Amino acid sequence: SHHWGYGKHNGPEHWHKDFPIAKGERQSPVDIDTHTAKYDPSLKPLSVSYDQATSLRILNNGHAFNVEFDDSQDKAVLKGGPLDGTYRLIQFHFHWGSLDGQGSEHTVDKKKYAAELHLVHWNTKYGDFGKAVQQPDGLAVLGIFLKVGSAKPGLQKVVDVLDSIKTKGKSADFTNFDPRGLLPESLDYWTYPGSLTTPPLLECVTWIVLKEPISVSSEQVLKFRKLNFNGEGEPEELMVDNWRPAQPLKNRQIKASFK
Numbered sequence: 189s190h191h192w193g194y195g196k197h198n199g200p201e202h203w204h205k206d207f208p209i210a211k212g213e214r215q216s217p218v219d220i221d222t223h224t225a226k227y228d229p230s231l232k233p234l235s236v237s238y239d240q241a242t243s244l245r246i247l248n249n250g251h252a253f254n255v256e257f258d259d260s261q262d263k264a265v266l267k268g269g270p271l272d273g274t275y276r277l278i279q280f281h282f283h284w285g286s287l288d289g290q291g292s293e294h295t296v297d298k299k300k301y302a303a304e305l306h307l308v309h310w311n312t313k314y315g316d317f318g319k320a321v322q323q324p325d326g327l328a329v330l331g332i333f334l335k336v337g338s339a340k341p342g343l344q345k346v347v348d349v350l351d352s353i354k355t356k357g358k359s360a361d362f363t364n365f366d367p368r369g370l371l372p373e374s375l376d377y378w379t380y381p382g383s384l385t386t387p388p389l390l391e392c393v394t395w396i397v398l399k400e401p402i403s404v405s406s407e408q409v410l411k412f413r414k415l416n417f418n419g420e421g422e423p424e425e426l427m428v429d430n431w432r433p434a435q436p437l438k439n440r441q442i443k444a445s446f447k
């Protein structure tokens with residue numbers, strides 16, 4: 189079994205030994221150079237259709253926490269933008285820092301945000317998530333930056349359940365959560381082909397990173413930082429700095445939906 193994490197001894201600089209694709213040609217995240225990203229008038233609008241989203245459960249997996257959805261039908265889907273066909277929401281999670289000046293995976297002109305939300309979707313032409321991750325167009329991840337300022341009201345139900353999933357392997361029922369409450373006003377975005385940002389680092393993702401961050405309060409992000417990487421009864425390792433740094437862009441172009 190693999191034993192990867194975010195520490196000195198098991199962090200991103202070590203991942204290539206068990207996961208050689210870590211040094212591949214389409215790794216994520218990347219720095220978004222806003223001056224070199226080109227407006228693409230060919231991009232179709234972006235369609236976030238979350239009205240029928242069915243959340244089920246929240247899980248501390250020892251790396252982050254996942255809010256899991258019922259993806260047995262087209263209940264919550266992402267379409268349009270750079271995407272061909274229909275991508276079904278399966279889970280969302282965050283990456284965050286030990287302090288407000290770091291935590292995001294993507295950077296914008298080298299700026300790090302306090303955290304980054306990833307809404308993970310799979311291409312329904314491949315029938316299940318496990319088949320989709322084996323395809324270069326298998327996943328679409330919608331990335332949203334978090335900055336610290338005013339509270340995000342739609343985030344508070346997530347913040348309030350974290351005390352019940354403090355340690356690795358703990359889960360709690362998490363029904364009737366509306367992910368529309370985590371979006372900013374604007375759907376302007378950057379897009380590029382990349383990878384999962386954690387092992388197994390598969391090169392199966394179309395990244396869609398929104399330009400407009402959401403604001404969350406200091407109190408909300410402080411509660412993320414009280415989670416634990418460790419299991420119950422084990423020495424406490426606070427769940428902080430669960431982000432991979434920017435990877436080489438190589439032969440890729442970042443496209444902007446906006447001028």
Ligand SMILES: COc1ccc(/C=C(/C(C)=O)C(=O)Nc2ccc(S(N)(=O)=O)cc2)cc1
Nearest residue numbers: 249306308321329383384385386387388390
């Ligand atoms: C054989 O391949 C795989 C087998 C299982 C999984 C399992 C997942 C879990 C934990 O449910 C999963 O969804 N992983 C995931 C990791 C990073 C991102 S991210 N940061 O790039 O958005 C998004 C999603 C993934 C691949």
Ligand code: NA
Nearest residue numbers: 259260315316
């Ligand atoms: Na299915």
Ligand SMILES: [Zn+2]
Nearest residue numbers: 281283306385
């Ligand atoms: Zn992620």
